[PDB]
Amino acid sequence: MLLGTFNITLDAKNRISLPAKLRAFFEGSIVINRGFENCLEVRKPQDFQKYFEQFNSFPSTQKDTRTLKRLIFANANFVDVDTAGRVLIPNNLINDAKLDKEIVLIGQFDHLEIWDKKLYEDYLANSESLETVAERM
Amino acid sequence: MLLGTFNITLDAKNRISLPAKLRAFFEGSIVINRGFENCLEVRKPQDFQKYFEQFNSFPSTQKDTRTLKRLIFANANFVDVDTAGRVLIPNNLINDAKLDKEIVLIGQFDHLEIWDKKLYEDYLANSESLETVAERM
Amino acid sequence: FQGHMLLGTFNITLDAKNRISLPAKLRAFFEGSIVINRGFENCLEVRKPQDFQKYFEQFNSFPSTQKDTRTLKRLIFANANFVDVDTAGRVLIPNNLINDAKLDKEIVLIGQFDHLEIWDKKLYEDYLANSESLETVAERM
Amino acid sequence: PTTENLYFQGHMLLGTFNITLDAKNRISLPAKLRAFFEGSIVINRGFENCLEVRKPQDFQKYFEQFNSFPSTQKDTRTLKRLIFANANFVDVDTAGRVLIPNNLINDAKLDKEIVLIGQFDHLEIWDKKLYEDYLANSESLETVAERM
Amino acid sequence: FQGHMLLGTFNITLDAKNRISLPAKLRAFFEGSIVINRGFENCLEVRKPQDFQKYFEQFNSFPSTQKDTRTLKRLIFANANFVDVDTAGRVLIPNNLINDAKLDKEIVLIGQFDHLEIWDKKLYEDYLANSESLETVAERM
Amino acid sequence: MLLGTFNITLDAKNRISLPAKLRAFFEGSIVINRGFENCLEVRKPQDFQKYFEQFNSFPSTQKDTRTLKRLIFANANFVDVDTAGRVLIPNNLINDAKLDKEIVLIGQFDHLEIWDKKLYEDYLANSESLETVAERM
Amino acid sequence: FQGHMLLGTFNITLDAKNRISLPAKLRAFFEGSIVINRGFENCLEVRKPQDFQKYFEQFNSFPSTQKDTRTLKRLIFANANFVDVDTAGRVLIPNNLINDAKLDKEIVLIGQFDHLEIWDKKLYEDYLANSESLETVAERM
Amino acid sequence: PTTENLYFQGHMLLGTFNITLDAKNRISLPAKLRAFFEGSIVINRGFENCLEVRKPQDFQKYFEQFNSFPSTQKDTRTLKRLIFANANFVDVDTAGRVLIPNNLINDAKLDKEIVLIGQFDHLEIWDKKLYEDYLANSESLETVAERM
């Protein structure tokens, strides 16, 4: 289970050190891919496996399904968690998530999201209430 | 199963002593996270596991689902129940639930909810009848 | 069977210490513990913990993301309690529940197969007095 | 009673029977019917004022049918309360007699002259008059069926 | 199979004692007892008790909280009876049923696989005389 | 597996010799009954059993169902396939299918249909295209 | 798998005796017998009997009381045939089918996984020439 | 390749790879990819002019998803004919190379400079230009997703 919020800094070599309470969750490898609202998702390969299983539940004969799958997997990568718990974030992803300095890692149980601190707070700042959003489920 | 209403006080160190009939239900660890209507939910990690899986039945390709998942899990945490049955509530959650002094714990079978006494009574004060709400299910 | 089906109507009195003696044909059904909780139309339900377990699971088929679901669950479980049936088959009804069901003196226990309901005699008779026919209600199912 | 018949009488309740209500409010199960029932039955009030009689097991299955009904719905609760609060276990004595409860005698307007009709699953008890009136009114077999 | 399917049309006479002799190819299908009950379009149905058992199971799939379901079941089972097939393959048709089907003299037995139907010859031909085509009726299923 | 089209003649005693490739499929007995569009169907009693169970999924409380069932089964019959592979078609069925001389047997996998050569060709003559009919399924 | 998957396009000639030699990669797939039947858009389908069995079972999920269902089943099975694949891997195509598919000289066999389709080279190319895009057609599924 | 990496490389196809089309029309599977495939693959033309590559077993599963489609429907038949008539088994040689069929080379406008993108289930082969154009156009991740 990936839970919580974490404030960390983006390395000079574009790496982020997984907190610690988090390193435990991951093995020596993760899949990254770009997320929604410009955030970058991080999962254990096995979880990515299941995540993809949720996509295939979608038609695929439908153009949108193909665009979604291509946008996701075409920017997805395996990344080894080094001995120090660090992860090198790909150039393409650094840009997609506007990662600069000051990152926010939020646990989403299944996966972990990497945010630019500013963007995340802005997301939170906008964004409707918990009751409002929930009522629409 | 968690049943009942309990009136307790918020510790000076921001902790609450699980009643007793309740300690039984929990092991040495719980997940907390913010609830709906400003209340903080408490569950055994295993139950949190099942609670989460209930979300994955929701689109995910939908913006609202993502907001919901981010408002919940980003504010969820593992908290150890100390030897005395006390649980230390995180700062963020204390504020989200406007927890001050005088808490109300209500058993919701699956989980437990932590309320600010005032807010809860106000919630109960407003809130339609049991029959009215039920008829709409 | 005859001890696994809660059926019938029973007229009993509320104890001076707020307890009710389970009839007998009924004690059989229950072990040494029951869950009580407030019911609909001001009545208090009584079930074996296991049956309460199943009753609840039915509620998990309800959204939860929906506001009404949360209100329902909160009005029900916040007012539910475990109560031990003493050696004499008596059950002490909590203060809050005594009030919610306007229990005073003269109780009516009706078996609902799954559970048992506790009613203030007056309120129950009024409920029955109002209330549409069996055929009418049924046709709407 | 041939063993072939015996076998079915214990499997299905069929037929119409005219009997009298005892002075002590009992009815003697016909015979072809006693076979179907053990030593205990559940009675409960039925629809159109008729009282139903079932073997406890069958009553068990009958009830599970009601659990597919909401219960958060006020009507469901009324239905369940009108039925089970007026349901009772009754022992079929040695002579095949069943003593019908006061409340049920009144609800079905039972006086003297009863009609027992087998509904396969259960058996219904009617006041002779009420039953014939029910049959007198009541649309045709084809009419009712077409609406199913 | 060549003895577990009621197929065909048979013209027979109603006994002076209100009985019908099962053809023969038919007797085979039935044991020593049958269930009769009134059918639709005034015809009387005949089944082996086991088949009646299954036929009933097709009804209970119907509400029963619905007034129509109760009327249907009462109209059917209240006129249903067990009838022994005598040594000569004859079946005594109850008075009530004789009247319901306007049975007089000259009966038509049509096999419906599951059951067998008894018709007054006139009424049956009239039914056939009216009645839409096979294609028409079928298209509406 | 009953497949194909066969042109045969109606016997003087109202019988048809099952082709041969066909005799194989049937045992020594068949059920005949009138079909749709005036054709007479032929099946193995076992298959007739399954065909009937298909009707039982239909109302029965519906007048049309009862008519359908009465038009089919009242005109169904068991017929023994003699030693020479001949089948004597009942009077009633000969008339319903306007059988005279020159029959067309078409395999329908499940069953076999008997047609008056003229009527069949007319049926085929009219009758929409394969693609047209299929598109409406 | 490489012999449990009919894939590809094959250009072959129609024999002087109206036969076609199964490519080879294809013979593997088939045993010594196949069912042919006329396909959609004038093409003739070819399957292993077992697969034909499954293909048909799909058609039974269709009413049958519906006129269209009956026409469909009659247009298909009445024109279906068992054909033995000879020692040389040749298959003799029935006269009726040769005509239905306008088979002359120059055939195109396309694998459809489940089955194989036989086309007149011209007709196939025309089909391809017309025919919307892969994306267009797919979006409508 | 750590044994863990190898494990995952044989479980999912991920990543973007830039390679060159051989003079004999072959591509050398990257390496992290060869692990995923055995000695044979099925190719077939994809959507948006891209050619798909799968392990025969996966192609098996891919196809089954198609049988949920009518078939009596003209479009289903066109879809199945446009896909499978242009599908082929291709052996991955000893050097990890795959020779792409003429027809598929043309259908995907393959020339020189190919992009292989892993779609977990399968792998897509693109003409570098066409792929970037596809990416260039193409709405946002959030936008597309919101319509699912």
Curated annotation (Swiss-Prot), chains A, B, F:
The UniProt keyword set, sorted, is:
Cytoplasm, DNA-binding, Repeat, Transcription, Transcription regulation
Query: Which Gene Ontology CC terms are recorded?
Result: cytoplasm; nucleoid
List residues of the SpoVT-AbrB domain.
Answer: 5-47, 76-119
**Pfam families the UniProt entry points to:** MraZ
- Location, primary (coarse class): cytoplasm
Q: Where in the cell is it found?
A: Cytoplasm, Nucleoid
Q: Name one GO biological process term.
A: negative regulation of DNA-templated transcription initiation
Entry-linked InterPro entries:
MraZ, MraZ_C, MraZ_dom, MraZ_sf, SpoVT-AbrB_dom, SpoVT-AbrB_sf
In terms of Gene3D superfamilies, this protein maps to:
Transcriptional regulator MraZ domain
**One GO MF term, please?**
transcription cis-regulatory region binding
PANTHER family hit by this protein: TRANSCRIPTIONAL REGULATOR MRAZ (PTHR34701:SF1)
Its family remark reads: Belongs to the MraZ family.
Q: How does it assemble?
A: Homooctamer. Forms a ring.
Q: What is this protein called?
A: Transcriptional regulator MraZ
Specify the taxonomic lineage.
Bacteria, Bacillati, Mycoplasmatota, Mycoplasmoidales, Mycoplasmoidaceae
